[PDB]
Amino acid sequence: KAVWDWLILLLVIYTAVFTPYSAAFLLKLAVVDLIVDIMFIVDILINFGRIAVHYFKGWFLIDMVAAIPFDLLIGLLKTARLLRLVRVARKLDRYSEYGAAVLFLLMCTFALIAHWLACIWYAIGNMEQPHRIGWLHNLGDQIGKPYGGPSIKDKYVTALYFTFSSLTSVGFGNVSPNTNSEKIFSICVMLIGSLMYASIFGNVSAIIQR
Amino acid sequence: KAVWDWLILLLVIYTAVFTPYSAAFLLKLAVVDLIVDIMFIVDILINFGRIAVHYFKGWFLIDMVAAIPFDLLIGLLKTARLLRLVRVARKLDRYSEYGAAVLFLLMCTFALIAHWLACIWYAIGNMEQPHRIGWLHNLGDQIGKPYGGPSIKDKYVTALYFTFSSLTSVGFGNVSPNTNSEKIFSICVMLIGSLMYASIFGNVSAIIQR
Amino acid sequence: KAVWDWLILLLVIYTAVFTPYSAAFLLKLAVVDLIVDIMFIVDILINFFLIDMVAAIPFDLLIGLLKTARLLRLVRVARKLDRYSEYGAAVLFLLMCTFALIAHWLACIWYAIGNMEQPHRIGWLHNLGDQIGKPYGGPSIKDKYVTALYFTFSSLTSVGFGNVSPNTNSEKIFSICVMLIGSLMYASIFGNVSAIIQR
Amino acid sequence: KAVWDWLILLLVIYTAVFTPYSAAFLLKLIGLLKTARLLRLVRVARKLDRYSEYGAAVLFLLMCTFALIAHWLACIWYAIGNMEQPHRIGWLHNLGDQIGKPYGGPSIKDKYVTALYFTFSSLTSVGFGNVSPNTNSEKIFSICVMLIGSLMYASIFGNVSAIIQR
Ligand SMILES: COc1ccc(CCN2CCC(Nc3nc4ccccc4n3Cc3ccc(F)cc3)CC2)cc1
């Protein structure tokens, strides 16, 4: 049970990594998804004299809405699995025992935020493309693949690199917003980066000396 | 008349957002401005028999010059409404009781400074228009709307995005200064952003800890 | 005597501003220079020693290049730091002034580097001339100084606007040195400012 | 023994600067095995306690390791760029087009200066825009470089802010 919580933390990290990715890029394997949802089902099973009434006190329903399947496009409906992060949020006291764990959690949450912003950025640059201004056209013109166009690997890597540059104050200049929606997204990313960057790096600066 | 203070704070935020924008861009709705003017007249009437003499020789001058009308440049003279910020300045004691209020005030003042700098940036670009050196010409050439020219939405979003990028010190490389006035303004904005960061956005973890 | 010390600080700021600029740009008003020199002579006379005499030698009969020895007047400000380090915004104002002075000196060095290779499309001066529509005599002294100061400020603040970027080995090494100096100075200045701001 | 430790530290800094430089730039297999000298820094790592007497010494050590990390990342970046140059994609071709000599191409001095300048710009979060990644390998390397550079920013200038108040 002691390692069960850490395993569940790894599983929620995995699903937070791979649910927006599948809902943004690969939407047009499932074995790992099936295994992970089975593990989450067995976890809610073990988590339940009769402490069941204590469990059904506003904490079981939020897991239930994040446990049921949606089988009956539909990536938006399986995007609801992201509610599982409340499980790792409810027991932060156990995970924050050691400073190294805190540093690992800070790095993981920064990477997760960058990944989520990358997925949102790709969605923004993809839904507008059918209507040479979008960043996908610039990406295709830069590499030797005019828009077929670049493969999904190149698009994801470029989106992640641009988001990391935006949050890290670099501003590389290869990828640069052109459309109004891209500029608004960049403004929101700048505000979010101010918040996170400041808090995370102040926290690590405090932590390192301890 | 206790929650009225936060309503007047919201109206102050509204006027500080919409007066510089109107002056900078719309010089070439009025109902909302008339409503907030009537509301501020009601407020200054409420501010009033032994207590009238107290502030009669105090804050009356500013709160009266900020509420007098000029309808009879009128648009340029309408900028006198910015004196309503002294209300928030003087009544800061009631707006600094909770950490959430402090964070909201910090975000609001950051956004307000960015908006004001965007308005000044567009003002400079407009005064330099009749003399592809300027940034408006480059923006029009790059969003596919050669100089007609970009719409007001495009110009405002571009100005706000440039100001946010430069204050945050990202420097995206889409819009860049190309005139002496623009370069001096950029130097000033860099100084303002660096001071803003090193003054407030440092130790934001400790700020939140309050 | 406090008014005298503040005026001396202002004149030191003036000479630190105007000596490197003159040496870098104006070399290939004198009345104000002579007035300030006479005022510094009367200041050392009323002070009643070696470090003051060497920096105040009248250079008569390259003189303009050799005039940089007048930049030895900031040490005099350093001695009387007790009155400058005092409660209020004076410390923050002085820190901003020295940051701007470092930016100005680096801008002068950047223009000196750019001009030494101008006679030899490659280089920031040619790019600057092309951008503002004055192909290479190209840009005026005002344009060159503003561009150099803007690039130096962007490099020190790490904005990196991308309008002006190093494109030669000399400029690249200079930008590396400015990056190191800016890291150290940014850390120091905006750590002490961020610690002072608690008052 | 006081002067001996400083001399050994200088020699360790010298070999740590030189060996990856040779391996990455002056290849033309023995150098790959010779790069095992990088583990020799464990001596300075264990004697850092002896090197932590005064704030000036630790500040200079911080600047030295900043420069060393920048140098190693520059060597790795040059190796990445050179592994794809034979097969306008990349940064070597763009650099050759910029400075004037098309791909002969730039000399070793120009290539190293460009690599170090880009590494410093990415580490210090400037992003000059003169040279930018254009391949997936380069993009991933840049992504790693931003994080390590910002971590070193936080650490070494938090230290610097600590000593300056002392
Ligand atoms: C050349 O040598 C050097 C060495 C070091 C430095 C300081 C660089 N470092 C200092 C912090 C700077 N960021 C930054 N400005 C901000 C302005 C307002 C609010 C927040 C700000 N934030 C944090 C931030 C960062 C990224 C982001 F997306 C959003 C916010 C920029 C990062 C400069 C020159």
PDB file of all heavy atoms in Angstrom, chain B residues 133 162 166 169-171 173 176-178 180 183 187 190-191 194-195 198, chain C residues 96 131-132 142 146-147 150 153-154 158-161 163 186 190 194:
ATOM      1  N   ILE B 133       9.146  51.574 -42.856  1.00  0.00           N
ATOM      2  CA  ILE B 133       9.996  51.772 -41.686  1.00  0.00           C
ATOM      3  C   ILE B 133       9.224  51.494 -40.402  1.00  0.00           C
ATOM      4  O   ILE B 133       9.724  50.816 -39.497  1.00  0.00           O
ATOM      5  CB  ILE B 133      10.588  53.193 -41.698  1.00  0.00           C
ATOM      6  CG1 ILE B 133      11.652  53.328 -42.789  1.00  0.00           C
ATOM      7  CG2 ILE B 133      11.187  53.532 -40.346  1.00  0.00           C
ATOM      8  CD1 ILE B 133      12.417  52.056 -43.075  1.00  0.00           C
ATOM      9  N   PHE B 162       3.151  42.903 -28.220  1.00  0.00           N
ATOM     10  CA  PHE B 162       4.518  43.415 -28.187  1.00  0.00           C
ATOM     11  C   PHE B 162       4.873  43.951 -26.810  1.00  0.00           C
ATOM     12  O   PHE B 162       5.966  43.690 -26.295  1.00  0.00           O
ATOM     13  CB  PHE B 162       4.710  44.510 -29.234  1.00  0.00           C
ATOM     14  CG  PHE B 162       5.956  45.331 -29.026  1.00  0.00           C
ATOM     15  CD1 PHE B 162       7.176  44.896 -29.507  1.00  0.00           C
ATOM     16  CD2 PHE B 162       5.907  46.539 -28.353  1.00  0.00           C
ATOM     17  CE1 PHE B 162       8.319  45.644 -29.319  1.00  0.00           C
ATOM     18  CE2 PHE B 162       7.052  47.289 -28.163  1.00  0.00           C
ATOM     19  CZ  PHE B 162       8.256  46.839 -28.646  1.00  0.00           C
ATOM     20  N   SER B 166       7.830  42.460 -24.409  1.00  0.00           N
ATOM     21  CA  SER B 166       9.003  43.240 -24.035  1.00  0.00           C
ATOM     22  C   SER B 166       9.093  43.448 -22.527  1.00  0.00           C
ATOM     23  O   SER B 166      10.191  43.408 -21.963  1.00  0.00           O
ATOM     24  CB  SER B 166       8.993  44.581 -24.760  1.00  0.00           C
ATOM     25  OG  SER B 166       9.802  45.514 -24.074  1.00  0.00           O
ATOM     26  N   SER B 169      10.288  40.424 -21.136  1.00  0.00           N
ATOM     27  CA  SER B 169      11.627  40.191 -21.677  1.00  0.00           C
ATOM     28  C   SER B 169      11.707  38.848 -22.397  1.00  0.00           C
ATOM     29  O   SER B 169      12.654  38.083 -22.211  1.00  0.00           O
ATOM     30  CB  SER B 169      12.708  40.291 -20.599  1.00  0.00           C
ATOM     31  OG  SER B 169      12.713  39.131 -19.790  1.00  0.00           O
ATOM     32  N   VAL B 170      10.703  38.558 -23.216  1.00  0.00           N
ATOM     33  CA  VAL B 170      10.788  37.448 -24.156  1.00  0.00           C
ATOM     34  C   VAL B 170      11.387  37.902 -25.479  1.00  0.00           C
ATOM     35  O   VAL B 170      12.349  37.312 -25.973  1.00  0.00           O
ATOM     36  CB  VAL B 170       9.398  36.807 -24.351  1.00  0.00           C
ATOM     37  CG1 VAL B 170       9.420  35.846 -25.521  1.00  0.00           C
ATOM     38  CG2 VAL B 170       8.969  36.088 -23.089  1.00  0.00           C
ATOM     39  N   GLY B 171      10.832  38.963 -26.056  1.00  0.00           N
ATOM     40  CA  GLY B 171      11.343  39.479 -27.334  1.00  0.00           C
ATOM     41  C   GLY B 171      11.095  38.530 -28.470  1.00  0.00           C
ATOM     42  O   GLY B 171      12.061  37.913 -28.936  1.00  0.00           O
ATOM     43  N   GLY B 173      10.371  38.832 -31.764  1.00  0.00           N
ATOM     44  CA  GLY B 173      11.090  38.970 -33.040  1.00  0.00           C
ATOM     45  C   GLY B 173      10.162  39.119 -34.222  1.00  0.00           C
ATOM     46  O   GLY B 173      10.671  39.180 -35.351  1.00  0.00           O
ATOM     47  N   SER B 176       9.471  44.473 -34.211  1.00  0.00           N
ATOM     48  CA  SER B 176      10.688  44.987 -33.611  1.00  0.00           C
ATOM     49  C   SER B 176      10.816  46.461 -33.954  1.00  0.00           C
ATOM     50  O   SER B 176      10.396  46.889 -35.034  1.00  0.00           O
ATOM     51  CB  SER B 176      11.925  44.226 -34.108  1.00  0.00           C
ATOM     52  OG  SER B 176      12.042  44.318 -35.516  1.00  0.00           O
ATOM     53  N   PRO B 177      11.380  47.258 -33.051  1.00  0.00           N
ATOM     54  CA  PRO B 177      11.531  48.689 -33.320  1.00  0.00           C
ATOM     55  C   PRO B 177      12.439  48.948 -34.511  1.00  0.00           C
ATOM     56  O   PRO B 177      13.446  48.267 -34.709  1.00  0.00           O
ATOM     57  CB  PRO B 177      12.147  49.200 -32.016  1.00  0.00           C
ATOM     58  CG  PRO B 177      11.502  48.280 -31.025  1.00  0.00           C
ATOM     59  CD  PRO B 177      11.796  46.968 -31.672  1.00  0.00           C
ATOM     60  N   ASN B 178      12.074  49.951 -35.305  1.00  0.00           N
ATOM     61  CA  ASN B 178      12.879  50.330 -36.459  1.00  0.00           C
ATOM     62  C   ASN B 178      12.972  51.841 -36.623  1.00  0.00           C
ATOM     63  O   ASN B 178      13.404  52.307 -37.683  1.00  0.00           O
ATOM     64  CB  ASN B 178      12.315  49.702 -37.735  1.00  0.00           C
ATOM     65  CG  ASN B 178      13.394  49.338 -38.730  1.00  0.00           C
ATOM     66  OD1 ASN B 178      14.542  49.761 -38.598  1.00  0.00           O
ATOM     67  ND2 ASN B 178      13.032  48.547 -39.733  1.00  0.00           N
ATOM     68  N   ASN B 180      13.785  55.728 -34.315  1.00  0.00           N
ATOM     69  CA  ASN B 180      14.440  56.225 -33.109  1.00  0.00           C
ATOM     70  C   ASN B 180      13.457  56.354 -31.951  1.00  0.00           C
ATOM     71  O   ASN B 180      13.765  55.960 -30.819  1.00  0.00           O
ATOM     72  CB  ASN B 180      15.108  57.567 -33.398  1.00  0.00           C
ATOM     73  CG  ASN B 180      16.504  57.411 -33.951  1.00  0.00           C
ATOM     74  OD1 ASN B 180      17.121  56.356 -33.820  1.00  0.00           O
ATOM     75  ND2 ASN B 180      17.010  58.462 -34.581  1.00  0.00           N
ATOM     76  N   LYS B 183      12.696  52.954 -30.646  1.00  0.00           N
ATOM     77  CA  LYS B 183      13.808  52.406 -29.873  1.00  0.00           C
ATOM     78  C   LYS B 183      13.884  53.023 -28.481  1.00  0.00           C
ATOM     79  O   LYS B 183      14.133  52.316 -27.497  1.00  0.00           O
ATOM     80  CB  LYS B 183      15.118  52.612 -30.630  1.00  0.00           C
ATOM     81  CG  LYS B 183      15.375  51.571 -31.701  1.00  0.00           C
ATOM     82  CD  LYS B 183      16.396  52.056 -32.705  1.00  0.00           C
ATOM     83  CE  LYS B 183      16.549  51.077 -33.850  1.00  0.00           C
ATOM     84  NZ  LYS B 183      17.095  51.736 -35.065  1.00  0.00           N
ATOM     85  N   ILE B 187      13.469  51.062 -24.937  1.00  0.00           N
ATOM     86  CA  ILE B 187      14.410  51.143 -23.819  1.00  0.00           C
ATOM     87  C   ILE B 187      13.664  51.461 -22.530  1.00  0.00           C
ATOM     88  O   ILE B 187      13.888  50.837 -21.480  1.00  0.00           O
ATOM     89  CB  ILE B 187      15.498  52.192 -24.108  1.00  0.00           C
ATOM     90  CG1 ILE B 187      16.441  51.702 -25.205  1.00  0.00           C
ATOM     91  CG2 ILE B 187      16.269  52.519 -22.847  1.00  0.00           C
ATOM     92  CD1 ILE B 187      17.114  52.819 -25.962  1.00  0.00           C
ATOM     93  N   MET B 190      11.683  48.401 -21.421  1.00  0.00           N
ATOM     94  CA  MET B 190      12.577  47.409 -20.832  1.00  0.00           C
ATOM     95  C   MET B 190      12.923  47.778 -19.398  1.00  0.00           C
ATOM     96  O   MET B 190      12.898  46.927 -18.500  1.00  0.00           O
ATOM     97  CB  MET B 190      13.855  47.286 -21.662  1.00  0.00           C
ATOM     98  CG  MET B 190      13.678  46.678 -23.035  1.00  0.00           C
ATOM     99  SD  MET B 190      15.271  46.444 -23.839  1.00  0.00           S
ATOM    100  CE  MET B 190      15.117  47.548 -25.239  1.00  0.00           C
ATOM    101  N   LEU B 191      13.254  49.051 -19.165  1.00  0.00           N
ATOM    102  CA  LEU B 191      13.550  49.490 -17.806  1.00  0.00           C
ATOM    103  C   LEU B 191      12.347  49.298 -16.893  1.00  0.00           C
ATOM    104  O   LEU B 191      12.482  48.797 -15.767  1.00  0.00           O
ATOM    105  CB  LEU B 191      13.984  50.954 -17.810  1.00  0.00           C
ATOM    106  CG  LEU B 191      15.480  51.223 -17.678  1.00  0.00           C
ATOM    107  CD1 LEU B 191      16.217  50.597 -18.840  1.00  0.00           C
ATOM    108  CD2 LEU B 191      15.748  52.716 -17.613  1.00  0.00           C
ATOM    109  N   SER B 194      11.842  45.524 -16.161  1.00  0.00           N
ATOM    110  CA  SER B 194      12.851  44.995 -15.251  1.00  0.00           C
ATOM    111  C   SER B 194      12.604  45.465 -13.824  1.00  0.00           C
ATOM    112  O   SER B 194      12.709  44.677 -12.874  1.00  0.00           O
ATOM    113  CB  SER B 194      14.243  45.408 -15.724  1.00  0.00           C
ATOM    114  OG  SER B 194      15.150  45.459 -14.640  1.00  0.00           O
ATOM    115  N   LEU B 195      12.267  46.747 -13.655  1.00  0.00           N
ATOM    116  CA  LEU B 195      11.948  47.252 -12.323  1.00  0.00           C
ATOM    117  C   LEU B 195      10.711  46.567 -11.757  1.00  0.00           C
ATOM    118  O   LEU B 195      10.699  46.162 -10.590  1.00  0.00           O
ATOM    119  CB  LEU B 195      11.749  48.765 -12.371  1.00  0.00           C
ATOM    120  CG  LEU B 195      13.024  49.600 -12.295  1.00  0.00           C
ATOM    121  CD1 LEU B 195      12.776  51.001 -12.822  1.00  0.00           C
ATOM    122  CD2 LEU B 195      13.535  49.642 -10.867  1.00  0.00           C
ATOM    123  N   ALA B 198      11.793  42.854 -10.734  1.00  0.00           N
ATOM    124  CA  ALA B 198      12.674  42.784  -9.574  1.00  0.00           C
ATOM    125  C   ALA B 198      12.047  43.388  -8.328  1.00  0.00           C
ATOM    126  O   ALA B 198      12.493  43.084  -7.216  1.00  0.00           O
ATOM    127  CB  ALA B 198      13.998  43.482  -9.878  1.00  0.00           C
TER     128      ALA B 198
ATOM    129  N   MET C  96      20.075  52.612 -10.555  1.00  0.00           N
ATOM    130  CA  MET C  96      19.580  52.758 -11.919  1.00  0.00           C
ATOM    131  C   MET C  96      20.548  53.577 -12.766  1.00  0.00           C
ATOM    132  O   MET C  96      20.786  53.257 -13.938  1.00  0.00           O
ATOM    133  CB  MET C  96      18.191  53.396 -11.911  1.00  0.00           C
ATOM    134  CG  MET C  96      17.189  52.764 -12.877  1.00  0.00           C
ATOM    135  SD  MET C  96      16.789  51.005 -12.694  1.00  0.00           S
ATOM    136  CE  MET C  96      17.089  50.681 -10.954  1.00  0.00           C
ATOM    137  N   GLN C 131      18.268  48.587 -42.785  1.00  0.00           N
ATOM    138  CA  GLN C 131      16.936  48.543 -42.185  1.00  0.00           C
ATOM    139  C   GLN C 131      16.247  49.902 -42.230  1.00  0.00           C
ATOM    140  O   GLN C 131      15.075  50.001 -42.611  1.00  0.00           O
ATOM    141  CB  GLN C 131      17.021  48.037 -40.745  1.00  0.00           C
ATOM    142  CG  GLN C 131      17.616  46.650 -40.602  1.00  0.00           C
ATOM    143  CD  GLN C 131      17.695  46.198 -39.161  1.00  0.00           C
ATOM    144  OE1 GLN C 131      17.403  46.962 -38.242  1.00  0.00           O
ATOM    145  NE2 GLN C 131      18.093  44.950 -38.953  1.00  0.00           N
ATOM    146  N   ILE C 132      16.955  50.965 -41.848  1.00  0.00           N
ATOM    147  CA  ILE C 132      16.337  52.278 -41.697  1.00  0.00           C
ATOM    148  C   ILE C 132      16.293  53.006 -43.033  1.00  0.00           C
ATOM    149  O   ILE C 132      15.898  54.176 -43.101  1.00  0.00           O
ATOM    150  CB  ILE C 132      17.072  53.122 -40.640  1.00  0.00           C
ATOM    151  CG1 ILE C 132      18.471  53.492 -41.130  1.00  0.00           C
ATOM    152  CG2 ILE C 132      17.143  52.377 -39.319  1.00  0.00           C
ATOM    153  CD1 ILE C 132      19.319  54.167 -40.080  1.00  0.00           C
ATOM    154  N   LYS C 142      23.137  60.234 -34.459  1.00  0.00           N
ATOM    155  CA  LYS C 142      22.005  59.976 -33.577  1.00  0.00           C
ATOM    156  C   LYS C 142      21.466  58.567 -33.776  1.00  0.00           C
ATOM    157  O   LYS C 142      21.229  57.838 -32.805  1.00  0.00           O
ATOM    158  CB  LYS C 142      20.906  61.010 -33.819  1.00  0.00           C
ATOM    159  CG  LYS C 142      19.620  60.729 -33.063  1.00  0.00           C
ATOM    160  CD  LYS C 142      18.668  61.909 -33.138  1.00  0.00           C
ATOM    161  CE  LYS C 142      17.257  61.500 -32.758  1.00  0.00           C
ATOM    162  NZ  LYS C 142      16.234  62.339 -33.438  1.00  0.00           N
ATOM    163  N   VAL C 146      21.616  55.642 -30.920  1.00  0.00           N
ATOM    164  CA  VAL C 146      20.370  55.089 -30.399  1.00  0.00           C
ATOM    165  C   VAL C 146      20.305  53.592 -30.659  1.00  0.00           C
ATOM    166  O   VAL C 146      19.881  52.820 -29.793  1.00  0.00           O
ATOM    167  CB  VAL C 146      19.156  55.824 -30.994  1.00  0.00           C
ATOM    168  CG1 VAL C 146      17.875  55.165 -30.535  1.00  0.00           C
ATOM    169  CG2 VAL C 146      19.165  57.274 -30.565  1.00  0.00           C
ATOM    170  N   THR C 147      20.732  53.153 -31.846  1.00  0.00           N
ATOM    171  CA  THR C 147      20.726  51.727 -32.146  1.00  0.00           C
ATOM    172  C   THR C 147      21.676  50.962 -31.236  1.00  0.00           C
ATOM    173  O   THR C 147      21.330  49.889 -30.729  1.00  0.00           O
ATOM    174  CB  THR C 147      21.097  51.499 -33.607  1.00  0.00           C
ATOM    175  OG1 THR C 147      20.242  52.286 -34.442  1.00  0.00           O
ATOM    176  CG2 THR C 147      20.939  50.036 -33.962  1.00  0.00           C
ATOM    177  N   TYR C 150      20.158  50.848 -27.733  1.00  0.00           N
ATOM    178  CA  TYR C 150      19.008  49.953 -27.705  1.00  0.00           C
ATOM    179  C   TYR C 150      19.442  48.493 -27.733  1.00  0.00           C
ATOM    180  O   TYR C 150      18.915  47.671 -26.973  1.00  0.00           O
ATOM    181  CB  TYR C 150      18.083  50.299 -28.874  1.00  0.00           C
ATOM    182  CG  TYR C 150      17.364  49.151 -29.546  1.00  0.00           C
ATOM    183  CD1 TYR C 150      16.205  48.617 -29.005  1.00  0.00           C
ATOM    184  CD2 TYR C 150      17.818  48.637 -30.752  1.00  0.00           C
ATOM    185  CE1 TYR C 150      15.537  47.585 -29.632  1.00  0.00           C
ATOM    186  CE2 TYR C 150      17.158  47.608 -31.382  1.00  0.00           C
ATOM    187  CZ  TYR C 150      16.019  47.085 -30.818  1.00  0.00           C
ATOM    188  OH  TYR C 150      15.361  46.058 -31.447  1.00  0.00           O
ATOM    189  N   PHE C 153      21.004  47.692 -24.280  1.00  0.00           N
ATOM    190  CA  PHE C 153      19.963  47.554 -23.268  1.00  0.00           C
ATOM    191  C   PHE C 153      19.207  46.244 -23.432  1.00  0.00           C
ATOM    192  O   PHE C 153      18.895  45.573 -22.442  1.00  0.00           O
ATOM    193  CB  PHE C 153      19.000  48.736 -23.338  1.00  0.00           C
ATOM    194  CG  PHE C 153      19.298  49.825 -22.350  1.00  0.00           C
ATOM    195  CD1 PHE C 153      19.705  51.075 -22.779  1.00  0.00           C
ATOM    196  CD2 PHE C 153      19.160  49.602 -20.991  1.00  0.00           C
ATOM    197  CE1 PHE C 153      19.974  52.080 -21.872  1.00  0.00           C
ATOM    198  CE2 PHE C 153      19.431  50.602 -20.083  1.00  0.00           C
ATOM    199  CZ  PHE C 153      19.837  51.842 -20.523  1.00  0.00           C
ATOM    200  N   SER C 154      18.897  45.866 -24.675  1.00  0.00           N
ATOM    201  CA  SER C 154      18.193  44.609 -24.906  1.00  0.00           C
ATOM    202  C   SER C 154      19.045  43.417 -24.489  1.00  0.00           C
ATOM    203  O   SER C 154      18.530  42.446 -23.925  1.00  0.00           O
ATOM    204  CB  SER C 154      17.787  44.498 -26.375  1.00  0.00           C
ATOM    205  OG  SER C 154      18.679  43.670 -27.094  1.00  0.00           O
ATOM    206  N   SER C 158      18.211  41.048 -21.488  1.00  0.00           N
ATOM    207  CA  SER C 158      17.949  39.723 -22.047  1.00  0.00           C
ATOM    208  C   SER C 158      16.627  39.670 -22.802  1.00  0.00           C
ATOM    209  O   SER C 158      16.001  38.613 -22.897  1.00  0.00           O
ATOM    210  CB  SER C 158      17.981  38.641 -20.968  1.00  0.00           C
ATOM    211  OG  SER C 158      16.705  38.494 -20.375  1.00  0.00           O
ATOM    212  N   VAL C 159      16.180  40.805 -23.336  1.00  0.00           N
ATOM    213  CA  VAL C 159      15.013  40.776 -24.208  1.00  0.00           C
ATOM    214  C   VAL C 159      15.362  40.116 -25.533  1.00  0.00           C
ATOM    215  O   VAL C 159      14.624  39.254 -26.026  1.00  0.00           O
ATOM    216  CB  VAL C 159      14.449  42.194 -24.407  1.00  0.00           C
ATOM    217  CG1 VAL C 159      13.322  42.167 -25.414  1.00  0.00           C
ATOM    218  CG2 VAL C 159      13.960  42.752 -23.091  1.00  0.00           C
ATOM    219  N   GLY C 160      16.501  40.479 -26.114  1.00  0.00           N
ATOM    220  CA  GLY C 160      16.921  39.913 -27.379  1.00  0.00           C
ATOM    221  C   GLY C 160      15.919  40.175 -28.482  1.00  0.00           C
ATOM    222  O   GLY C 160      15.283  39.245 -28.983  1.00  0.00           O
ATOM    223  N   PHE C 161      15.769  41.444 -28.862  1.00  0.00           N
ATOM    224  CA  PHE C 161      14.727  41.815 -29.814  1.00  0.00           C
ATOM    225  C   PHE C 161      14.933  41.160 -31.172  1.00  0.00           C
ATOM    226  O   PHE C 161      13.967  40.959 -31.915  1.00  0.00           O
ATOM    227  CB  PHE C 161      14.671  43.333 -29.963  1.00  0.00           C
ATOM    228  CG  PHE C 161      13.677  43.990 -29.055  1.00  0.00           C
ATOM    229  CD1 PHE C 161      14.097  44.710 -27.956  1.00  0.00           C
ATOM    230  CD2 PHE C 161      12.322  43.882 -29.299  1.00  0.00           C
ATOM    231  CE1 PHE C 161      13.184  45.310 -27.121  1.00  0.00           C
ATOM    232  CE2 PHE C 161      11.408  44.481 -28.465  1.00  0.00           C
ATOM    233  CZ  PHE C 161      11.840  45.196 -27.375  1.00  0.00           C
ATOM    234  N   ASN C 163      16.342  42.463 -33.737  1.00  0.00           N
ATOM    235  CA  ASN C 163      16.570  43.443 -34.790  1.00  0.00           C
ATOM    236  C   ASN C 163      18.059  43.611 -35.061  1.00  0.00           C
ATOM    237  O   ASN C 163      18.495  43.613 -36.218  1.00  0.00           O
ATOM    238  CB  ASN C 163      15.940  44.780 -34.404  1.00  0.00           C
ATOM    239  CG  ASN C 163      15.172  45.408 -35.540  1.00  0.00           C
ATOM    240  OD1 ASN C 163      14.830  44.744 -36.516  1.00  0.00           O
ATOM    241  ND2 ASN C 163      14.904  46.702 -35.426  1.00  0.00           N
ATOM    242  N   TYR C 186      23.424  42.060 -13.402  1.00  0.00           N
ATOM    243  CA  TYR C 186      21.994  41.910 -13.188  1.00  0.00           C
ATOM    244  C   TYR C 186      21.723  41.229 -11.859  1.00  0.00           C
ATOM    245  O   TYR C 186      20.919  41.715 -11.055  1.00  0.00           O
ATOM    246  CB  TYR C 186      21.386  41.112 -14.342  1.00  0.00           C
ATOM    247  CG  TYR C 186      19.908  41.333 -14.563  1.00  0.00           C
ATOM    248  CD1 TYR C 186      19.453  42.077 -15.644  1.00  0.00           C
ATOM    249  CD2 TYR C 186      18.964  40.782 -13.707  1.00  0.00           C
ATOM    250  CE1 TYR C 186      18.105  42.277 -15.857  1.00  0.00           C
ATOM    251  CE2 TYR C 186      17.613  40.978 -13.913  1.00  0.00           C
ATOM    252  CZ  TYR C 186      17.190  41.725 -14.990  1.00  0.00           C
ATOM    253  OH  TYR C 186      15.847  41.923 -15.202  1.00  0.00           O
ATOM    254  N   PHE C 190      19.969  43.726  -9.158  1.00  0.00           N
ATOM    255  CA  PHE C 190      18.569  43.434  -8.913  1.00  0.00           C
ATOM    256  C   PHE C 190      18.374  42.405  -7.811  1.00  0.00           C
ATOM    257  O   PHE C 190      17.246  41.954  -7.592  1.00  0.00           O
ATOM    258  CB  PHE C 190      17.902  42.992 -10.213  1.00  0.00           C
ATOM    259  CG  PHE C 190      17.857  44.076 -11.245  1.00  0.00           C
ATOM    260  CD1 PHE C 190      18.842  44.170 -12.212  1.00  0.00           C
ATOM    261  CD2 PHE C 190      16.849  45.022 -11.231  1.00  0.00           C
ATOM    262  CE1 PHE C 190      18.810  45.176 -13.155  1.00  0.00           C
ATOM    263  CE2 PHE C 190      16.813  46.031 -12.170  1.00  0.00           C
ATOM    264  CZ  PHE C 190      17.794  46.107 -13.135  1.00  0.00           C
ATOM    265  N   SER C 194      16.084  44.385  -5.019  1.00  0.00           N
ATOM    266  CA  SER C 194      14.982  43.571  -4.524  1.00  0.00           C
ATOM    267  C   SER C 194      15.067  43.332  -3.024  1.00  0.00           C
ATOM    268  O   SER C 194      14.077  42.910  -2.422  1.00  0.00           O
ATOM    269  CB  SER C 194      14.943  42.233  -5.263  1.00  0.00           C
ATOM    270  OG  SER C 194      15.148  42.413  -6.654  1.00  0.00           O
TER     271      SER C 194
END
